[PDB]
From a paper:
HA is a transmembrane viral surface protein which is responsible for interacting with host cell receptors and mediating virus entry. Three HA1/HA2 heterodimers assemble to form a trimer spike protruding from the virus envelope, with the HA2 and the short N- and C-terminal fragments of HA1 forming membrane-proximal stem and the large middle fragment of HA1 forming the membrane-distal head. Triggered by the decrease in pH in late endosomes during virus entry, HA undergoes conformational changes that underlie its transition from a prefusion state to a postfusion state. Through initial biochemistry and cryo-EM data analyses, we found that F005-126, a neutralizing antibody targeting the HA head of H3N2 viruses, fulfills all our requirements.
The HA-Fab complex at pH 7.8 (HA-Fab-pH 7.8) was determined at a resolution of 2.8 Å. Atomic models of the HA ectodomain and the bound Fabs were built. The bound Fab F005-126 has direct interactions with residues 171–173, 239, 240 of one HA protomer and residues 91–92, 270–273, 284–285 of a neighboring protomer. The three central helices of the HA trimer intertwine to form a left-handed triple-stranded coiled coil. The N-terminal Helix Cs are tightly packed through extensive hydrophobic interactions. Unlike the canonical coiled coil, the C-terminal Helix Ds are loosely packed and do not have a hydrophobic core. The hydrophobic distal ends of the fusion peptides insert deeply into the pockets between the Helix Ds and form a hydrophobic core of residues Leu2 and Phe3.
Author numbering:
A (entry chain A): 9 to 99
B (entry chain A): 273 to 326
C (entry chain B), D (entry chain D), E (entry chain F): 1 to 172
The structure:
């Protein structure tokens, strides 16, 4: 003689644990990571002008170290200075 | 190493995507980079509280 | 969980619900049926889709800064640089932690609020023809076929044409 | 909008209401009338009047600071000064943005809460003599003249002296 | 105080309540009795016990920093050190103030929410056998002895076995 109407909400078989003001760990249907913790390991050459300094430091390229002669009149947005860089001119 | 690709944010560890607001890769950054934090993970809830059956 | 709807009197999520976030399950003479409420689901999704661009609009663009790694030991200036960077890192880490906690708490309260709002709206449609059973489910006290149920879900339910039968069934 | 009262089941603001923020409109045999509820309006106004002095008590007083504009180029010290000032500016800009967003959200929830509280109080006064029509309006099931309506608004409504007539009208 | 339960329609705290935070007082034919609801009290206590470790996990460990007190007057470097320390102190003082205000507001809303949740749960158990008197107290319309009251408090109240008598008493 009667009908029944239930109200409910969706669930998921496995859920993500997040932290709130009142709970250290509470399970929710979905969650997004906000901290980027990994890198590709390579420097993209766009959109910034990247100047790879092979064996040269910025000061050595500035002064005009012979093995730095390829860096004359160079421009950069980011000068990438390598650990293998060394000086080979007057001390 | 340098690569042929597009990325706005460069760290000493390489280029990283800047879609996330925070990063834990390196405190040295260049470009449009996420803010550096000490936490390695921060989950933002994008759904309701999950109550499975049983 | 301020309203006690989700993880409250509802007591259970529906893993068979994939159409939306909030919806109805009905059992009547014809048989069991299920549907999703698009309006409440869309309200919750809209209130959740941003929620981080509204506080941190974009990544700030920084090009030339202080040095943050040092080979040798200078003294005052290196100490000041390290102190400045450490202070900035601590403050931003606290900001991130507090923001995430606040947003998660508000999102939980928000979804629970949408659930409670749907419940109250459905109750208000069923003025005297239904009774809350206390588990988030309404007992409707009249013949309510599929058209009746869809009218309830639609929002165009007409409580007047069933009021006599419903009152006769409830209060005998 | 956590309770679904404002921009919810109320569905509409009254531009003719200038006496207060929350109030009543009544239609009975005598005719239409309107009034404002001073207590709820005052509660909301009191909870809103400060709300910024409670977090930022006053302007801090700063007299001699670092230089923030430079003509020539020095190097380390100028870079450190620029970095410190930029870090401070970014942190305070984030603080301002987050504070404004949080306070606006709480103010909206607060006003919606006061509306819902007034609604629930009015419903509780009208124990069995009225029914919620679902649009924020009560159908009262007895002769309720202007004195009756003002008693409802006053808070001294006596549901017992109308209960017989109201039950007779509702359940027939 | 978003729900209007505490300092709302409840209107009064019970100083004789020491067993828990939330509870029941009942008056029937046998006599007055009082008990505490352990589940709601435990929910509120659990949501309050941390609430600061969830934002500030621990004290950060700092060993060697800049100098913050100076005997003589140097100039640029001392000014920069003072500016950095003052900026850090102001930002952390603001953080402390805002965090305390936010947590206090949420704690008040949380306890008020637990009170309202207990009230709604009790109302939903007493489907048609009781009426809300508007002061946080239910008038139950049937013989409800101590076993009946403890069943209400327990959660295993069976509204069906009293429904006839309760309807007969309410609607005459
Ligand atoms: C949780 O939300 C995320 C964010 O949208 C969803 O992840 C996306 O899912 C779609 C599926 O069509 C993919 O195309 C996207 O590439 C995903 N984005 C990311 C960043 O992973 C995810 O599906 C949601 N989870 C659930 C269970 O709904
Ligand atoms: C997903 O669900 C399965 C079972 O439903 C579970 O074993 C697993 O741990 C969950 N998470 C992932 C990441 O697979
Ligand atoms: C639902 O309501 C709309 C508008 O009142 C109507 O056009 C439609 O036919 C109804 N039924 C549905 C969508 O099944
Ligand atoms: C409203 O109530 C107060 C106190 O019960 C009473 O003094 C007053 O006469 C009532 N009517 C009004 C203010 O119109
Ligand atoms: C309360 O309910 C529980 C479980 O239904 C039952 O075991 C117990 O006897 C009841 N009465 C009490 C605890 O007085």
């Amino acid at each position: 003689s009667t009908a029944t109407l239930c109200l409910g909400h969706h669930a998921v078989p496995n859920g993500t644990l997040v932290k709130t003001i009142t709970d250290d760990q509470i399970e929710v249907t979905n969650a997004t990571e906000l901290v980027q913790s990994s890198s590709t390991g390579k420097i993209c050459n766009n959109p910034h002008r990247i100047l790879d300094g092979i064996d040269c430091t910025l000061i050595d390229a500035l002064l005009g170290d012979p093995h730095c002669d390829v860096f004359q009149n160079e421009t950069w947005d980011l000068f990438v200075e390598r650990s293998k860089a060394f000086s080979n001119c007057y001390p | 190493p340098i690569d042929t690709c597009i990325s706005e944010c460069i760290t000493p560890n390489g280029s990283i995507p800047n879609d996330k607001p925070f990063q834990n890769v390196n405190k040295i950054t260049y470009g449009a980079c996420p803010k550096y934090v000490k936490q390695n993970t921060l989950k933002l809830a994008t759904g309701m509280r999950n109550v499975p059956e049983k | 969980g301020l309203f006690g709807a989700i993880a409250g009197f509802i007591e259970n999520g529906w893993e068979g619900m994939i159409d939306g976030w909030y919806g109805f399950r009905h059992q009547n003479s014809e048989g069991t049926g299920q549907a999703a409420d698009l309006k409440s689901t869309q309200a919750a999704i809209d209130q959740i889709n941003g929620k981080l661009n509204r506080v941190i609009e974009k990544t700030n663009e920084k090009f030339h800064q202080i040095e943050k790694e040092f080979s040798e030991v200078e003294g005052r200036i290196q100490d000041l640089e390290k102190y400045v960077e450490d202070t900035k890192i601590d403050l931003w880490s606290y900001n991130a932690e507090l923001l995430v906690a606040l947003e998660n708490q508000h999102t939980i309260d928000l979804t629970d609020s949408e659930m409670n709002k749907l419940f109250e709206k459905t109750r208000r449609q069923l003025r005297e023809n239904a009774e809350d059973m206390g588990n988030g489910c309404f007992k409707i006290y009249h013949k309510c076929d599929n058209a009746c149920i869809e009218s309830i879900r639609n929002g165009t339910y007409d409580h007047d044409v069933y009021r006599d039968e419903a009152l006769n069934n409830r209060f005998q």
